[PDB]
Amino acid sequence: ALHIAIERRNMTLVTLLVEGFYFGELPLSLAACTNQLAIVKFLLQNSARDSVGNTVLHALVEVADNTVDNTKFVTSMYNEILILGAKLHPTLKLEEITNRKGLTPLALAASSGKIGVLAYILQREIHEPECRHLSRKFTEWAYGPVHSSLYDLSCIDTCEKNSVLEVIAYSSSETPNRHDMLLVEPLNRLLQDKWDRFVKRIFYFNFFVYCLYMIIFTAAAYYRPVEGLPPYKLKNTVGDYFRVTGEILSVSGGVYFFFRGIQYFLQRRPSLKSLFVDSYSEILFFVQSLFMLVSVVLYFSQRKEYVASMVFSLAMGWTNMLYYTRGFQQMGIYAVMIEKMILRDLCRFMFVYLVFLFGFSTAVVTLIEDSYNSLYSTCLELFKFTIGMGDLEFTENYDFKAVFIILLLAYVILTYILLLNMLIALMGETVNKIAQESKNIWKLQRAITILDTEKSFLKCMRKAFRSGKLLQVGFTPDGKDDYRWCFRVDEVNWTTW
Amino acid sequence: ALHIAIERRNMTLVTLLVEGFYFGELPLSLAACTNQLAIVKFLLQNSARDSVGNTVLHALVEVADNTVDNTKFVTSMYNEILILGAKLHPTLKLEEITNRKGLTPLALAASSGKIGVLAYILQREIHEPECRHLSRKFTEWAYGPVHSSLYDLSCIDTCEKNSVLEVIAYSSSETPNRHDMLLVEPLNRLLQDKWDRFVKRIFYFNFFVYCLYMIIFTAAAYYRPVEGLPPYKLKNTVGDYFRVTGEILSVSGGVYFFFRGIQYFLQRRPSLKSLFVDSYSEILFFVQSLFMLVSVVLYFSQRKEYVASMVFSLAMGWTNMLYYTRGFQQMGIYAVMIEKMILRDLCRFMFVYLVFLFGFSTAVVTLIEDSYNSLYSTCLELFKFTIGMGDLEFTENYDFKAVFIILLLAYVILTYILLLNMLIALMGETVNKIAQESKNIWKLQRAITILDTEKSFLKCMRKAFRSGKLLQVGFTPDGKDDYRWCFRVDEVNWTTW
Amino acid sequence: ALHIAIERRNMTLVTLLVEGFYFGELPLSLAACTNQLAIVKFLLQNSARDSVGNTVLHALVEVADNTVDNTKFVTSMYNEILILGAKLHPTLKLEEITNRKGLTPLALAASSGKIGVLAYILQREIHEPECRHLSRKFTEWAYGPVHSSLYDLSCIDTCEKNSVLEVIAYSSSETPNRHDMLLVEPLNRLLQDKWDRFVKRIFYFNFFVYCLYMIIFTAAAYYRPVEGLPPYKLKNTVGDYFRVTGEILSVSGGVYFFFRGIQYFLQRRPSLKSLFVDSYSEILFFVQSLFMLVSVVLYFSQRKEYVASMVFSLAMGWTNMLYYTRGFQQMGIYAVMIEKMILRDLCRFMFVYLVFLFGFSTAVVTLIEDSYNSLYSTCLELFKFTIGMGDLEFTENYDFKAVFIILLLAYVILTYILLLNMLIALMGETVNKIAQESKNIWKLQRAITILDTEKSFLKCMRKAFRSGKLLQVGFTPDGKDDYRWCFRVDEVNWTTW
Amino acid sequence: ALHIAIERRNMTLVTLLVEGFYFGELPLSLAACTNQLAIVKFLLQNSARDSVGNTVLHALVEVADNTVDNTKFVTSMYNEILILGAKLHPTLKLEEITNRKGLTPLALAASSGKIGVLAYILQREIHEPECRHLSRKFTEWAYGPVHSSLYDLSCIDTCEKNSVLEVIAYSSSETPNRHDMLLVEPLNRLLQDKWDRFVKRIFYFNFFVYCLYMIIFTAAAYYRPVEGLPPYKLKNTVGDYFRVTGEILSVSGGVYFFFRGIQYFLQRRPSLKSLFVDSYSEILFFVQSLFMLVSVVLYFSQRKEYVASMVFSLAMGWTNMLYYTRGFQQMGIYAVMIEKMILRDLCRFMFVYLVFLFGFSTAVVTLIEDSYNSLYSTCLELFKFTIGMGDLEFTENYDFKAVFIILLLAYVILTYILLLNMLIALMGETVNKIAQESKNIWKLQRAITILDTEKSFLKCMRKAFRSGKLLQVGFTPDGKDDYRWCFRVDEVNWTTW
Ligand SMILES: COc1cc(CNC(=O)CCCC/C=C/C(C)C)ccc1O
Ligand SMILES: COc1cc(CNC(=O)CCCC/C=C/C(C)C)ccc1O
């Protein structure tokens, strides 16, 4: 009755009565979510939590499609509902109420990834002195066409459970707007300010330390003993001393990266199904650590097979230096494109190319009578065509010339001239598509680095720098108390006047 | 008189009289096809089949150009004519009348490929209780802005001769909209539902069985006897037993694919002129079967030349595994692009490159005096330049150094640096063009697989699943009887309200 | 006075008086060219040739900028002036008057390349019976929305000196619209009709004959005598007879192409500055003929150096078969792109690459002490890097390892990885730009082939086919005589009604 | 009070009182910069230099954002202020006042790079005889729709300290519009006129002289003595005489380029941080000179290591010939693209590729036991994969086959197939982006060449040609004196009428 009549958008029906689409589980949520501006007014004058913990604000954000009209009336109705909550209940902070997951409506908007409501809440301001405390953005002053704005940033830096910026950064990448979500003024300028302030220096110190670690590890690997099986007994030579110091430093760094990989996985707890896409760099750093530890295990197991794992660790550590080039803007896009291919284009192309290579490998191997008769050897001899180093007659031990050479021509036309250039065209398309995208994936993960660095910060460095500035605000009618950690930012728009 | 006056769009002329462009062969067809809304009303109040079997509805669809205004008034006039048929003759189902080809007007629209009238008929609904049975789309209910729609789907799943979806899928690809024709709501959701329901499992079972067949066939080919001429006498060794089992299984699969190719060609009966373009995969599977059967023939003919055909079958079977990757969405586009090149770009480029290669091959061969003097050998030595493995002096047995080396430089500049990169640029253009196209060619052939799988389904599996759901409809004035196999689908549009 | 006042666009000034921009050299030309609709009326009521032979129509076409407003009022004023010429002088055919160059105003519009006035004159029609003969386009009839139009085509097929289509086709390519100029209805359909009618068959007969000539010439070249110096004495063997027949046929074709090149150059007389751009194919065919004749000269000069020229002719003849692939639509674009590169991109890239190659060649040669010390040999060894067949240590006879290997690395980075891929990117840009352009350059030169084929046609084949159809037209008031060679074409536009 | 009230845009506040954003440091600058059209009128009726030397005009240009509305009202208010300066003070030339840097407001606009105000001042004209001298553009006459305009060009050719064109050309490339800034009519036509007039001939003479110098230097290098250590004693042979002449000419050119590099660096004094980006060609010419001088030093130091530096100079001189190809239009874009890559794409890709190459080099070297064991040798053997000349088994001296070959496959997939094609895609994107940009970077540096050539011109050639023409102008009310070096240019716009 109430549900059907309210959903009918009939004011008369609601006035007469009261006197799988998810829209909340209470009448207020239905009325608000259905664009009923006046019906909610009557229902209030004729902050509830539903069975899922979602209040009317949660039902508002849950329904928004992020489109222009959706964002328009959703923001408007959010404002009206929050005002009537203000006038009827000034002291109540309806936003503080959280669902089962524990997110506030702003945090819910960030989690789901709707930039409309997010930007509205971020830039919100209410002139009316009826509820002056209820404004997110405070305008400091204007001298000419200049405007020095302030933004509240209550839970954007460090909240009770999850801050807004944390949720944006640690999104599983299924959230659509994620990169664009950082473009909004307060978050963007806050990120750049934190980066320039102190996190830049720590990041370069980390980068230099990692370079130093990799250089000493490369030296210690290069000059490994070649006599006998390990472990090789310590010698009194200065070279021996430097070498044992290099090995112990390298394995210390290895276990360090191992523990950091574990603790990252525990903190984030990402889905194993989407482990690669969200976190590519961490997997590689962890696997480098794992190769180092496996190498140490095989080393003290009295096996010569330790150099196999150690060499993989050495190569992968150098090829993991790109992670630091995401600290810059110019190089970070470049590395992001390598991540995108190795995740998307290169696995595709490898499965297809392996179908082709294996088909023609088995074909030529069965054709050859019989030394290139090991299916491995023929696979290599057919792979050497892709690198432009193969030859049309690697063998002469076939009964049939026409069949063999036809097989090789068909393979070369299929892979060297056709598949490989399909990959060239596809990576051209990828660069064309993501020339704009990578510019903000870079920012997104630059934000992840900032959050990781500040999280791994002790009391002294964290107390020495907190975001924004603690500034008093408009006193509330309940107790004349409103002081917040508000950030400050400038702006000059001529049309503002 | 009637024809000329009616075509003049003069209501007065028709009222006075009655009282190579194909527009139907009766006055009603001319009046309807010429946008004469009122003239047809008088002609009715002042369902015929013409000499070609085309009724007024057939003349309507035949005339539509599928453009915005054409579709607009064609759909409108179709509605008006069908309503007047309803009021004057409620019991008559004018659409059931078919032309000589046997297609209904909806089937005719699908065959010709006009998405305008097709989408109109697919989404048609008539509120008026004057003829309530005459609505294609039935709205189940609406709780809020939710709308649970139902679509009739009379002949879209299994009709008397040809269903709508069958005609869309088995189109010769000359029909323009074919891919877009599957995007329309009922067909699209019906396809995805059928795929997810049961056809997905059968397709993966088929894919795994094909992989198993190819692996056992690869093993049986690899370990073929190398002693003497065939047939090789059975041995009591376990290896001999496994090998004979592998050979008999491989040839059984070969004859299976042979028969399936034949029966496909009989069912579809495609034009030999356009055999490749419409059906690329079937040709390859059939030719693999043909190579296997030729190999068996040469095997029991006591010839050593069986391995030639068997090896071609083995290679082509592996390279035909891409057909299954059209079952996925990510990989199917990739395989479709290979089909597109081998049909369009690669034949072009091969004819041109063969002109160039043969010209410079004959040039260098006539220049050489004389061992590279076989026109085959020089062709290979000039082909090795394309793969980046050739050399500017493969021979020294020429009287003229300048002429020979000039020929080679001109060839390399013409083919390696210029033609081959024209192919690179062309495939870049192809990917740029069809990045959107392949996304729906994939769907189109995914639909072909679904239809093929359901067609090759016995009574039990077909009766266990029929599309849509049998639900009663608005009773007709003739006998109060309207029950259809109507599909159900949800939708949420805010502007609908 | 008259000039300044008329150019002032003051009707009062002209009425009072009469009672380096090229705008014609008479008052009427100034008034018409300056948008003075009424002033010309008074000047006529208050067909001259100027010192350059340009009438008012010539001054009209000379001034048009081909833009939307320019074409609009130019076409309008052309119509008004031509009508007033009609009423004041019905018998006069003002268009027949020609300038010094001999072009009529329509021919002048075609020569200068303004598609606006050209399309207007091509599609012109005048309903008014005041001058019914003065309409270019005659509407045959309309049955429904069908319209069977007729176009006059007086001088479009075969005029006194230069036909319209001839001027469009033989344009020096500086004319901007040239390709688009053939898209206009009468010319386009006339071209396609002539092609399908008889010229298609002659073109394929020519193509097959050329293939036959090249095959017999390839055979005669391949089996040349290798003993002694020429001329080689005739032998009674059947092989000798076939070989002398092949040689005489080949040289006959060579002299044939030589004479055709000469007569083409005399007929067209193109500028030597722009000889390549306008006529690429003719230069190559002529040079093949020239190589054959030089080979015959050296052959009968008792020199073994005839095979050098003959081999160049043999290679270039095969590589000239692309000219026939411009007869098709699919392959013609492909060949046109090769023409475009060899004219534009490849000369650019060769000059730059030769600067680089010569710089590093001389560098490495001076570095080497000393066998790779011939500047030719080092140039080849550095060219072999581009084809992916070079090696970083081709020699060891250098005093300095670091300098030599640095030179080679710098060269490889500069040419193999950077210049060569600049060429790849540039040809990608070229294909991207001209994917649409080539589609109509093909048509343009397909038109050139049609004109060449019909020009080289005797009385019988020309009288057996003349374009259009001789049909009587609206009788003129002067003598009631108007019969023209009018072409016929259909059209169906719904908005026409 | 005055500042705040004026910035409030309240005319009443200013009338009542009077009776880090940079907007000038005086009330007039604030009123003008804030769009207060009327307030400045009162302030004048109720040419100051501020502490930074910026007058109201400087404050106007400093504030413009170059956007459509910004340029609109900035140009309008500039006109109004300059007129009121005219009426109140006709004799005063407010523009002549300069800031501390010495730039006039036009020069300031050019320096900052705002094309709006620049184009306005360049094309300015004032019809009103109230101040007729105050018009930049003078219209010579109009015969029909023709208009022969004149532009003043006071300080555009040769001013007191810095001309307008000089500032545009010598911009540090941080100025955004720089290329577009030369497109404006007077500057563009003035550049092309100067180029065609005399600078073209001098540039070709310089190009031919440089080619001659490089050829004689190449010859003198090629035939260097190979016996003993330098200096090689003079011989009486004619070859010895030509060789000493070649060496002395080559070193004379070397010192010439050295001095020109020094004097360029002194005149321009560009920032060492952005030395490459603004001036790529000069660095290369200077470094060629430096290599030649180092070679002479090592030559007279009795060392055989002179050929190392001389060979680098020889190679780099040839590869520096591209600088002259920026004199043409077709080739200049081509060379500019090489500059852009070697500055932007190639350093990026080299740092990443060096990370990868070094990682896998150290990996394979530590894996190898041990001749390819020098880390240099393995780096070369892994670089040879990029050029398509490497091989998967260059060595067999490894204990582990799987690990080694896995390392090589991973490297080849990472660099040859993935990184190198990321570079191909990136350079494709670069060409796509700058196909339009390079067309005007070419013009920009062609302007730099013109300015350099005229600057290095004596009294005779400079007095023989000065830009524009000295023509009298509208006499000023102060002393009836206005004569300027005004340039002349034609134009034909139909809409002008
Ligand atoms: C089987 O269906 C498909 C297959 C493919 C890829 N496979 C091919 O293109 C086969 C080409 C022929 C290669 C045979 C070589 C022999 C002579 C050694 C793409 C799309 C499909 O639908
Ligand atoms: C000189 O002005 C220009 C030159 C170029 C091309 N030249 C280069 O890029 C030189 C690169 C350095 C190559 C030197 C190799 C030595 C070490 C053997 C383009 C644009 C210009 O304006």
β-pairing, D483-492 vs D469-472, is antiparallel
Q: Ligand 1 atom 22: the closest Cα is on which residue?
A: B281
Q: Is A390 on the interface with B (CB under 8 A)?
A: yes
Q: Do both A218 and A315 map to the same domain?
A: yes
Whats the size of chain B, residue-wise? Answer: 497
**Which amino acid is residue B300, in one-letter code?**
F
Contacts of C396 (CB under 8 A, 6+ apart): none
Structure tokens at A200: 């830049």
**Testing the interface with B: which of C223, C229, C247, C314 to mutate, by most B Cβ within 10 A?**
C314
And the tokens for B252?
């059984």
In the block, tokens 């190498």 appear at A295
* Distance (Å) of CA B220 to CA B230, B244, B297, B307, D73: 15, 8, 17, 12, 85
Question: HEC profile for chain B?
Answer: CHHHHHHCCCHHHHHHHHCCCCCCCCHHHHHHHCCCHHHHHHHHHCCCCCCCCCCHHHHHHHHCCCCHHHHHHHHHHHHHHHHHHHHHCCCCCHHHCCCCCCCCHHHHHHHHCCHHHHHHHHCCCCCCHHHCCCCCEEEEECCCCEEEEEECCCCCCCCCCCCHHHHHHCCCCCCCCHHHHCCCHHHHHHHHHHHHHHHHHHHHHHHHHHHHHHHHHHHHHHCCCCCCCCCCCCCCCHHHHHHHHHHHHHHHHHHHHHHHHHHHHHHHCCCCCCHHHHCHHHHHHHHHHHHHHHHHHHHHCCCCCHHHHHHHHHHHHHHCHHHHHHCCCHHHHHHHHHHHHHHHHHHHHHHHHHHHHHHHHHHHHHHCCCCCCCHHHHHHHHHCCCCCCCCCCCCCCCCCHHHHHHHHHHHHHHHHHHHHHHHHHHHHHHHHHHCCCHHHHHHHHHHHHHHHHHHCCCHHHHHHCCCCEEEECCCCCCCCCCEEEEEEEEEECHHHC
- Of B322, D217, B37, B125, nearest in space to A349 by CA: B322
Contacts of A325 (CB under 8 A, 6+ apart): A331, A332, A334, A335, D351, D352
Would C50 be classed as within a structural domain? yes
| Three-state secondary-structure class, residue C147 | strand
Is the four-CA dihedral B232, B234, B240, B242 of positive or negative sign? positive
Q: Tell which phi-psi region holds residue D31, choosing left (phi > 0), alpha (psi between -120 and 50) or beta.
A: alpha
Q: Which of D4, D403, D413 sits opposite A311 (nearest CB)?
A: D403
Taking the centre of ligand 1 as the mean of its atom positions, its distance from the CA of residue B276, in whole angstroms, is 12
CA–CA distance, B138 with B147 (Å, rounded to integer): 11
D-chain residue closest to C421, CA distance: D424
Alpha-carbon gap: D195 to the closest alpha carbon of chain C (Å) = 23
Q: Whose CA is closest to C76, among C34, C120, C132, C23?
A: C120
User: Does residue A378 fall inside a structural domain?
Assistant: yes
**C240 and C261 fall within a common domain:** yes
> Is B331 in Cβ contact with A7 (below 8 Å)?
no
Both D91 and D209 in one domain: the answer is no
C338:B34 CB<8 A? no
> Which residue's alpha carbon is nearest to atom 14 within ligand 1?
B316
Residue B50 within any structural domain of the chain: no
Q: How many CB atoms lie within 10 A of CB A38?
A: 12
What's the distance, Cα to Cα, between the start and end of chain D in Å?
51
Distances (CA, A) of A409 to B316, B355, B364, D179, D391: 14, 17, 22, 51, 21
For residue D233, being part of any structural domain is answered with yes
Is residue D201 exposed (0-12), middle (13-18) or buried (19+ Cβ within 10 Å)? exposed
Same domain (yes/no): D339, D285:
no
Token pair recorded at residue D113:
């790079």
Domain end residue (candidates: B324, B342, B376): B324
C-alpha span between D313 and D291 (Å, rounded) = 5
Nearest to A288 by CA among A270, A267, A306, A261: A261
Interchain contact, A346 vs D413, CB within 8 Å: yes
Phi then psi for residue A200, to 5 deg, are: -60, -50
Is the bond preceding B27 in cis, omega lying within 30 degrees of 0?
Answer: no
- Residue A189, φ and ψ in degrees, nearest 5: -70, -35
CB C464 within 8 A of CB C479: no
Within A148-279, where are the H helices?
A: 164-169, 178-181, 185-194, 200-222, 238-268, 275-278
How many angstroms separate the Cα of B135 from the Cα of each of B87, B95, B128, B244, D356?
Answer: 14, 13, 9, 62, 66
D335 in contact with ligand 2, CB cutoff 6 A:
yes
CA D209 to chain CA centroid, Å, is 24
Rounded Cα distance, B342 and B333, in Å: 14
Backbone angles phi, psi at B176, to 5 degrees: -70, -45
CA separation for the pair D497, D483 (Å, rounded): 29
Which residue, B367, D16, A363, is CA-closest to C305?
Answer: B367
Largest CA distance in chain A: 98
Ligand 1 center to B83 CA (angstroms): 52
- Output the CA–CA distances (angstroms, integers) from residue A494 to A497, C456, D236, D394, in the order listed: 6, 73, 81, 68
Asked whether residue B309 is domain-assigned, the answer is: yes
Cβ atoms of residues B50 and B24 within 8 Å: yes
Written as six digits, the tokens of A209 are 């330390």
From the CB of residue A364, how many other CB atoms can be counted at a distance below 10 Å?
27
Residues D295 and D355 in one domain: no
Q: Which of A218, A352, A210, A351 is nearest to A281 (CA)?
A: A210
In angstroms, the Cα distances linking C378 to B365, C408, C416 are 27, 11, 16
Report DSSP letters for C254-316, one per residue. HHHHHHHHHHHHHHH---STTHHHH-HHHHHHHHHHHHHHHHHHHHHTT-TTHHHHHHHHHHH
Experimental method: cryo-EM
C420 → chain D, closest CA residue: D424
Residue C455 lies in a domain: no
CA distances from C335 to A392, B358, C321 (A): 29, 17, 10
Q: How far is C14 from chain D (nearest CA, A)?
A: 15
Q: Which of B312, B304, B305 is nearest to B230 (CA)?
A: B304
Ligand that lies nearest to the alpha carbon of residue C355, given by its number in the listed order: 2
Q: Report how far apart the first and last C-alpha atoms of chain B are (Å, whole number).
A: 51
A19 burial (CB, 10 Å; 0-12 / 13-18 / 19+) is: exposed
For residue D34, the chain A residues in CB contact (below 8 A) are 144-145
C-alpha to C-alpha distance for A96 and A104, rounded to whole angstroms: 6
Yes or no: say if C217 and C226 are a contact pair by the CB < 8 Å rule. no
For residues B259 and C315, what is the distance between their CA atoms, to the nearest angstrom? 48
Q: Are residues D310 and D347 in the same domain?
A: no
Rounded to whole angstroms, the Cα distance separating A85 from B162 reads 62
C266: exposed, middle or buried (Cβ count in 10 Å: 0-12, 13-18, 19+)? exposed
**Pick from D77, D13, A141: nearest CA to D3:** D13
CA C50 to chain centroid, in Å, comes to 32
Residue of D3, D4, D10, D21 to mutate for A, most A C-beta atoms under 10 A: D21
Give the count of beta carbons closer than 10 Å to the beta carbon of residue B46.
9
Residues 6+ away with beta carbon under 8 Å from D160: none
Round to whole Å and give the CA distance between D401 and D413: 18
Sign of the Cα torsion A340, A344, A350, A353 reads negative
SS3 label, residue D313? helix
Asked whether A150 and A137 are in contact (CB, 8 A), the reply is yes
Q: How far apart are the first and last CA of chain C?
A: 51
Angstrom distance (rounded) from CA A327 to CA A447 = 10
Same domain flag for A114 and A217: no
Query: How far, in Å, CA of D433 to CA of B408, rounded?
Result: 36
Q: Residue D101 is part of which domain span?
A: 1-122
Q: Tokens 């300290």 correspond to what residue?
A: D161
∠ CA B404-B407-B412, nearest 5°, is: 130
At A185, list the tokens: 């003024």
Phi-psi category of D40—alpha, beta or left, where left has phi over 0 and alpha has psi -120 to 50?
alpha
Q: How far is C388 from chain B (nearest CA, A)?
A: 5
The C-alpha atoms of residue D140 and residue D148 are separated, in whole angstroms, by 5
Number of CB pairs < 8 Å for C and D?
A: 141
List the subunits that have 3+ CB pairs under 8 angstroms with B. A, C
Handedness of CA A399, A400, A404, A405 (dihedral sign): positive
Token pair of A482, please? 């409103």
Tokens of C285: 């065919």
CA of D198 relative to ligand 2 center, distance in Å: 28
Q: How many CB atoms lie within 10 A of CB D346?
A: 20
Chain length of chain C:
497
Q: C129: which residues sit within 8 A by CB, 6+ positions away?
A: none
**DSSP code of residue C161:** S
B165 touching chain C per CB within 8 A: no
CB B157 within 8 Å of CB B436: no
Ligand 1 binding pocket (C-beta < 6 A) is: A 407, 410; B 280-281, 284-285, 312, 315-316, 319-320, 322-323, 335, 338-339, 342
If residue C241 lies in a helix (H) or strand (E), which one and from where to where?
A: helix C238-268
The answer to whether D407 contacts chain A (CB < 8 Å) is yes
Same domain for A400 and A322: no
Rounded to 10 degrees, the C-alpha dihedral A17/A21/A25/A31 comes to -40
H or E stretch at C483: strand C483-492
CB atoms within 10 A of CB D84: 14
Q: Are residues C313 and C348 in the same domain?
A: no
Taking Cα atoms as reference points, which of A375, A390, A379 lies closest to residue A357?
A379
Does the Cβ of D321 fall within 6 Å of ligand 2?
no
Cross-chain residue pair C34–D430, CB shorter than 8 Å: no
- Domain shared by D282 and D352, yes or no: no
- What 8-state DSSP symbol labels residue A130? G
Residue D312 touches chain C, beta carbons under 8 Å: yes
Residues 6+ apart with CB under 8 A from D293: D251, D254, D255, D258
Note whether B249 and B275 are within 8 A (CB): no
Last residue of a domain, one of C326, C358, C373: C326
Which amino acid is located at D299 in the chain? Y
Do D311 and D420 reside in the same domain of the chain?
A: no
Cβ contact, residue pair C365, D308, below 8 Å: no
What is the token pair recorded at C82?
């031509």
**Gap between the Cα atoms of D344 and A472, Å rounded:** 48
Residue C88 phi/psi, 5-degree rounding, is -70, -35
Q: D289 and D406: one domain?
A: no
Tokens coding A484: 């917040």
CB C257 within 8 A of CB C286: yes
Instruction: Name the phi and psi angles at B469, rounded to 5.
Output: -150, 140
A48 by DSSP, 3-state: which?
coil
- Please answer whether residues D26 and D1 qualify as being in contact, where contact means their C-beta atoms are separated by less than 8 angstroms: no
User: Count of A–B CB contacts within 8 Å?
Assistant: 141
Q: Are B363 and B378 in contact (CB under 8 A)?
A: no
How are strands ordered across the β-sheet holding A137-141?
Answer: A137-141, A146-151, A483-492, A469-472
| Cα–Cα distance, D233 to D225 (Å, whole number) | 10
Lookup: tokens for C169: 């086709």
Spatial neighbors of D98 by CB under 8 A, at least 6 apart, are D53, D104, D107
Beta bridge partners of B147: B491
CA distance C98 to C96: 6
* C363 Ramachandran zone, left/alpha/beta (phi>0; psi -120 to 50): alpha
Q: Whose CA is nearest to atom 2 of ligand 2?
A: D281
Q: Which of residues 132-151 of C touch B (CB under 8 A)?
A: 143-146
Count up the domains in chain C and report the number: 3
Tokens of C424: 């790849």
SS3 D373: coil
Q: Counting beta carbons within 10 angstroms of the beta carbon of residue D466, is it exposed (0 to 12), middle (13 to 18) or buried (19 or more)?
A: exposed
Instruction: Say what the alpha-carbon torsion angle C251, C253, C257, C259 is, to the nearest 10 degrees.
Output: 70
In sequence order, what DSSP letters do the residues of D403-463 get, joined into one string?
A: HHHHHHHHHHHHIIIIIHHHHHHHHHHHHHHHTTTHHHHHHHHHHHHHHHHHHT--HHHHH
Residue B24 lies in a domain: no
- Could you say which of B268, B301, B324 is where a domain stops? B324
Burial code (b: 16+ CB inside 10 Å, e: under 16) for B183-214 equals ebbbbeebbeebbeeebeebbeeeeeebeebb
For residue B399, the distance in angstroms to the closest alpha carbon of chain A comes to 27
Residue type for D258, please? F
Q: Is D5 on the interface with A (CB under 8 A)?
A: no
Contact D226 C369 (CB under 8 A): yes
d(CA B293, CA B288): 9
Q: Distance (Å, rounded) from C-alpha A444 to C-alpha C312?
A: 61
Helix (H), strand (E) at residue A412: helix A401-414
Pick from C314, C319, C428: CB nearest B366:
C314
CA gap B302, D488 in Å, rounded: 95
Cβ-Cβ contacts under 8 Å, B65 against chain C: 494
Please report, for the domain that includes residue A24, its CATH number.
Answer: 1.25.40.20
Tell me if B492 sits within 8 A of A21, measured CB to CB. Answer: yes
- Atom 4 in ligand 2: residue holding the nearest Cα: D320
CA distance D293 to D287: 10
Q: How far is CA C116 from CA C60, C70, C491, D141, in A?
A: 12, 9, 21, 31
**Can you list the positions of beta strands (E) in D281-331?**
none
Domain annotation covers residue A341: no
Q: Contact A346/D413 with Cβ under 8 angstroms?
A: yes
DSSP string over A135-186: -SEEEEE-SSSEEEEEE--SSSSS-SS--HHHHHHT--S-STTHHHHT-SHH
User: Which residue has tokens 């065209």?
Assistant: A425
Q: Taken in order A452, A455, A458, A461, is the CA torsion positive or negative? A: positive
Atom of ligand 2 nearest to the CA of D342: 9
CA atoms of A389 and A380, how far apart (whole Å): 11
Helix or strand (DSSP H, E) at D489: strand D483-492
Residue B145 preceded by cis peptide, ω within 30:
no
